[PDB]
Amino acid sequence: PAITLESPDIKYPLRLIDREIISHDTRRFRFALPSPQHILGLPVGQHIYLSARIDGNLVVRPYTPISSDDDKGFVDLVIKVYFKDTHPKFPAGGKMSQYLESMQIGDTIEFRGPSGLLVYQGKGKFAIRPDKKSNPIIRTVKSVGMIAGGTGITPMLQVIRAIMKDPDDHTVCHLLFANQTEKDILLRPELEELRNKHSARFKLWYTLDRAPEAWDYGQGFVNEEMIRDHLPPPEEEPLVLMCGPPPMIQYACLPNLDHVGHPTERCFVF
Numbered sequence: 001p002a003i004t005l006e007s008p009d010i011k012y013p014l015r016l017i018d019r020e021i022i023s024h025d026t027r028r029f030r031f032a033l034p035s036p037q038h039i040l041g042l043p044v045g046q047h048i049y050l051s052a053r054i055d056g057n058l059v060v061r062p063y064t065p066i067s068s069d070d071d072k073g074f075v076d077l078v079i080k081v082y083f084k085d086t087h088p089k090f091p092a093g094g095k096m097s098q099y100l101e102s103m104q105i106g107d108t109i110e111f112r113g114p115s116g117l118l119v120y121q122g123k124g125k126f127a128i129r130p131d132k133k134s135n136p137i138i139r140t141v142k143s144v145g146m147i148a149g150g151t152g153i154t155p156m157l158q159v160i161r162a163i164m165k166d167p168d169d170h171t172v173c174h175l176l177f178a179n180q181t182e183k184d185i186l187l188r189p190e191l192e193e194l195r196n197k198h199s200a201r202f203k204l205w206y207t208l209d210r211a212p213e214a215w216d217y218g219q220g221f222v223n224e225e226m227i228r229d230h231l232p233p234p235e236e237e238p239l240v241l242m243c244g245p246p247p248m249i250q251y252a253c254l255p256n257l258d259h260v261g262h263p264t265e266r267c268f269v270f
């Protein structure tokens with residue numbers, strides 16, 4: 001159809017048309033593409049760049065839509081709002097996130113894309129560029145390991161959806177979704193729906209820093225056992241995809257990946 005993100009260098013103002021309070025911090029923000037038949041123009045695996053001049057300082061932060069290029073007229077972004085005066089070190093909270101919460105209906109925010117090193121080309125085929133200028137290295141995988149932390153499910157979900165939507169895409173997605181509390185399990189219905197509908201291909205497990213009284217899943221930070229039991233066996237040569245808070249990736253993921261047997265080259269951070 002009509003691509004909204006025609007140029008990666010042009011910022012495209014889109015209007016906010018709906019907001020869904022996914023959780024206390026994270027909200028699903030729907031934006032209106034230029035035409036009701038216009039598409040976003042986002043290859044699976046890539047992300048967009050929201051740009052706005054907040055506090056006199058142009059702040060450009062990146063977000064991965066939960067919408068699919070199949071969806072027309074709208075762009076759904078599950079964005080967590082780091083609230084002000086809710087963190088001891090950060091009384092100013094998030095910058096773009098708080099602007100987005102403040103955004104009323106019909107306010108405009110600029111979009112830029114596509115941007116990203118990973119593109120899913122279908123049926124195991126992941127085009128991962130080592131650098132933005134270097135050419136993408138293409139590797140077909142039978143399983144995809146995925147470690148998502150909080151708002152880092154949106155890049156995973158994009159991939160999960162694409163694979164499950166193609167019945168000839170036999171790649172098997174293993175997801176490890178790490179959040180602080182049960183209330184913080186974003187897109188949990190969608191995810192559980194995906195698993196029920198495509199169990200053979202989608203394997204789902206959660207970990208919560210502070211779990212509820214009844215947690216049939218896992219507790220604590222990301223650990224080696226959960227990477228071992230709830231991600232693909234390293235022998236299957238899978239692709240471990242990771243999005244989470246930089247600390248979580250550095251201290252909980254990358255270390256415990258080595259322990260299980262996953263190589264750095266078979267692993268990618270969104």
Ligand SMILES: Cc1cc2nc3c(=O)[nH]c(=O)nc-3n(C[C@H](O)[C@H](O)[C@H](O)COP(=O)(O)OP(=O)(O)OC[C@H]3O[C@@H](n4cnc5c(N)ncnc54)[C@H](O)[C@@H]3O)c2cc1C
Pocket residue numbers: 047059061062063064065077078079080081082083084086087090092093094095096097098151152154155243270
């Ligand atoms: C590929 C990709 C996709 C992404 N997709 C999404 C997405 O879909 N949705 C999304 O929300 N984010 C997404 N992010 C992350 C996003 O860019 C930000 O991390 C954040 O959501 C908004 O930025 P900000 O300007 O609000 O943060 P900043 O203001 O730049 O954050 C500054 C620091 O303050 C901390 N901080 C501030 N207040 C608090 C608080 N109350 N509690 C804890 N820490 C606090 C932050 O954690 C951070 O360390 C994505 C990132 C990447 C790389």
